């Protein structure tokens, strides 16, 4: 029984070295060689106004045009980006959101917080209005992240350092996942949908497997806790923000760090990252009211995207990355293009 | 400009909005407050006499109150305090007869210390709210008070051991320029605690009116 | 379920006054635009009159204009139709729809039942030239419509709907929008075409298909339909 902390520490030294000796060069320099992107002007175009509160989450439906917020006043809106327009604006029960989620399909709409309780609306019903589907219960602690799958099962998150996979059909819990020591804050879903990462406030992030339920592989290095977390395009690599002003790219092949986006005048933490079509620009939200955009190739800046008046809170790219909405805590979503 | 279907929608859109604003308006006029103790200090005392978060409304004197209660939330507070950036007051319970805890008087010491210098709680004030002012005599009649703050010196009685605990609290405070920290001995069966509540909200109301008119 | 019931219809004398009631259950009536279409005892359908959600929007068909009044009472889920100055020519069935705007909606999609008037004794047009077409179970079959003008907005949405009416039946809605499938239609039903010509395909025709086909067009805001194609055997 005394092989405990001394066994441990032996195969951690043993992942050490393999992780050593598996490295070789490093992104920077096999990409020295790459033309610069150069200076990236965004503006906006569409200012989406309603919200009489902190915005605390957004996610971009699946045909490009009509987006979800959910803001602190108790209120999840439904926007049209291209005029505008409101289409639905569903009354919450609890007030106190943290996240919020669209179905691949556009049937549904998630969302959760500081009730412990991830709650399903039904948005194409019979009678004209939109009625709370389900109401999945479990967790002990708030929610920070639920993301669909297909229609039928969901992923959250949750202060209680642990991450379920629901069945709607029958609200339980199919499979949980645990392995974290702190709260975790967000997940990203492979574009497969058969893994996922996790990234939490112990300074980690694991990756794990749906159908399985046990984690492939544990990701370090940042001195802070992690609550920004998205998959690379390709789906072999992700990038994460932490609150020590520092963003991070990792990828699952190497199992290695490949390069960190960081700066000397930001001191600020990371509230948000998101990739582009391409994967090419790395578009990071900061505590600074700004959003930076960078060459996440070379760790270069290359554009800023001033214009928010308080703390940038959440950020989205559609799927065919024409725009780039970003919502904060003055009650305001822009789309940049 | 715009076709005949696409027209409808605006119409949607703006009733929409007037249902929003009207529903802003409404909230916009109830006082809020965050009840916070160091856990079975009188929290649920003090509910009595007016999972996750747990919300209670009540009215007093034509004025719309909600409290909201965190005791199910055993994670960490700095990843959602900031929720409650805007509340009208906080109030704290704290139980005079734990100064013996056969200790959890500095506990509440430290959690009071934590709560008051926040950064997000800059301008944000605080209701004290020492309960438990009966068993304080019997407790200081069998026990004496040097177990807890050995620096103290004074008589044992309900006059010196009582009004020196309301200080060593008030002392934690550090921004004594723009918040204001209003101590009360709880009552029995009793209404003054939400008159003290009532006079507490309206002057944090009156200064805010004053600050929002530039004045 | 969703329900609209019509009452107040009967014999009139020529120059007198009605009132036509339509009763809503089963759904949020609050947040619905509803729709007034006539029908005469021989011919095809007729629009009448049209009021909003929240009413701020009125329309009358440009020949009931000065003698119909549309109303709405949300609290008891009720709509009112106030026709004064009755002539012979209003002898008709009156239906009473339900539409709903907003991106992606289906507008049209619930038609009521009907009551029957019995009075005593620009303009787009749609374009139906064919009457009957004999059919088999087991065939496809193919209904074109021909507009004057382009039904399709510069927002890449072409305004052309399809209704169908069985024997002996209310209107029942197929194709929203040149594309779209209704909620509840078999797949076997298709539309398209281009502007100013559309087409609606059926393929392994069956039974329970009979029935008239009506082409509508929702550009500009008197509507109009079509003559109307009939399919027999």
């Known amino acids: 029984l005394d092989q405990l902390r001394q066994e441990a520490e032996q195969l951690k030294n043993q992942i050490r070295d393999a992780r050593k000796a598996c490295a070789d060069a490093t992104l920077s320099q096999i990409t020295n060689n790459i033309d610069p992107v150069g200076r990236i002007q965004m503006r906006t175009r569409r200012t989406l106004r309603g919200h009489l509160a902190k915005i605390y989450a957004m996610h971009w439906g699946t045909d490009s045009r009509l987006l979800v917020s959910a803001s602190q006043d108790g209120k999840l809106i439904i926007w049209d980006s291209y005029t505008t327009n409101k289409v639905h604006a569903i009354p919450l029960r609890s007030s106190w959101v943290m996240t919020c989620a669209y179905a691949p399909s556009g049937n549904y709409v998630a969302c959760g917080g500081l009730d412990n309780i991830c709650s399903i609306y039904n948005l194409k019903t019979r009678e004209g209005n939109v009625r709370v589907s389900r109401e999945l219960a479990g967790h002990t602690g708030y929610l920070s992240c639920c993301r669909f799958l297909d229609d039928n099962q969901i992923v959250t998150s949750s202060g209680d350092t642990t991450c379920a996979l629901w069945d709607i059909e029958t609200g339980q819990q199919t499979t949980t996942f645990t392995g974290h020591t702190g709260d975790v804050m967000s997940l990203s879903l492979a574009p497969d949908t058969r893994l996922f990462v996790s990234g939490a406030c112990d300074a980690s992030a694991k990756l794990w497997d749906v159908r399985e339920g046990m984690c492939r592989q544990t990701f370090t290095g940042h001195e802070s806790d992690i609550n920004a977390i998205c998959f690379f395009p390709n789906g072999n690599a992700f990038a994460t923000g932490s609150d020590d002003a520092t963003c991070r790219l990792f990828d699952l092949r190497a199992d290695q760090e490949l390069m960190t986006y960081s700066h000397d005048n930001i001191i600020c933490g990371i509230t948000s990252v998101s990739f582009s079509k391409s994967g090419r620009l790395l578009l990071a939200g900061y505590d600074d009211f700004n959003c930076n955009v960078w060459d996440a190739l070379k760790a270069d800046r290359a554009g800023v995207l001033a214009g928010h008046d308080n703390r940038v809170s959440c950020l989205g790219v559609t799927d065919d990355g024409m725009a780039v909405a970003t919502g904060s805590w003055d009650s305001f979503l822009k789309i940049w293009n | 400009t715009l076709s005949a279907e696409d027209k409808a929608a605006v119409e949607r859109s703006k009733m929409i909005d007037r249902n929003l604003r009207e529903d802003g308006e409404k909230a916009a006029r109830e006082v809020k407050l965050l009840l916070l103790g160091a856990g079975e200090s009188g929290k649920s005392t003090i509910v009595k006499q007016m999972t996750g978060i747990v919300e209670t409304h009540f009215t007093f004197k034509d004025l719309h109150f909600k409290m909201f209660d965190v005791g199910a939330q055993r994670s960490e507070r700095k990843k959602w305090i900031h929720c409650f950036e805007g509340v009208t007051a906080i109030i704290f319970c704290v139980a005079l007869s734990d100064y013996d805890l056969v200790n959890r008087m500095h506990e509440s010491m430290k959690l009071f210390d934590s709560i008051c210098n926040n950064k997000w709680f800059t301008d944000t004030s605080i209701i004290l709210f020492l309960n438990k002012k009966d068993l304080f005599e019997e407790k200081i009649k069998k026990s004496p008070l040097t177990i807890c703050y050995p620096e103290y010196a004074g008589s044992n009685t309900y006059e010196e051991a009582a009004a020196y605990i309301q200080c060593q609290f008030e002392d934690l405070n550090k921004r004594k320029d723009t918040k204001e920290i209003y101590t009360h001995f709880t009552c029995s069966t009793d209404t003054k605690n939400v008159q003290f509540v009532f006079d507490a909200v309206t002057d944090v109301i009156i200064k805010n009116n004053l600050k929002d008119c530039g004045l | 379920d969703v329900q609209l019931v019509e009452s107040g219809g009967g014999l009139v004398q020529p120059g007198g006054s009605r009132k036509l009631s339509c009763s809503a259950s089963?759904?949020?009536?609050?947040?619905?635009?509803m729709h007034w279409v006539r029908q005469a005892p021989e011919k095809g359908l007729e629009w009448v009159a049209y009021?909003?959600?929240?009413?701020?929007?009125?329309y009358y068909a440009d020949t009931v204009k000065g003698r119909f009044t549309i109303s709405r009472d949300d609290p008891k889920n009720t709509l009112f139709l106030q026709m004064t100055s009755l002539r012979s020519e209003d002898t008709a069935m009156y239906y009473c729809?339900?539409?709903?705007?907003?991106?992606?909606?289906?507008?049209?999609?619930?038609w009521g039942q009907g009551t029957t008037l019995t009075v005593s004794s620009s303009d787009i047009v749609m374009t139906q030239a064919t009457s009957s077409v004999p059919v088999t179970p087991g065939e496809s079959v193919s209904i074109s419509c021909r507009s004057s003008?382009?039904?399709?907005?510069?927002?890449?949405?072409?305004?052309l709907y399809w209704f169908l009416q069985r024997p002996g039946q209310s209107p029942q809605l197929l194709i929203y929008?040149?594309?779209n499938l209704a909620s509840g239609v078999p797949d076997r039903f298709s539309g398209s075409g281009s502007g100013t010509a559309f087409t609606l395909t059926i393929s392994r025709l069956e039974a329970e298909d009979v029935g008239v086909y009506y082409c509508?067009?929702?550009?500009?805001?008197?509507?109009?339909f079509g003559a109307g194609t009939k399919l027999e055997l």
């Open positions: 729809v339900r539409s709903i705007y907003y991106y992606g909606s289906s507008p049209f999609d619930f």
């Open positions: 089963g759904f949020a009536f609050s947040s619905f635009g």
């Open positions: 009021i909003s959600s929240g009413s701020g929007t009125i």
């Open positions: 003008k382009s039904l399709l907005h510069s927002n890449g949405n072409t305004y």
């Open positions: 929008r040149m594309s």
């Open positions: 509508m067009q929702h550009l500009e805001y008197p509507l109009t």
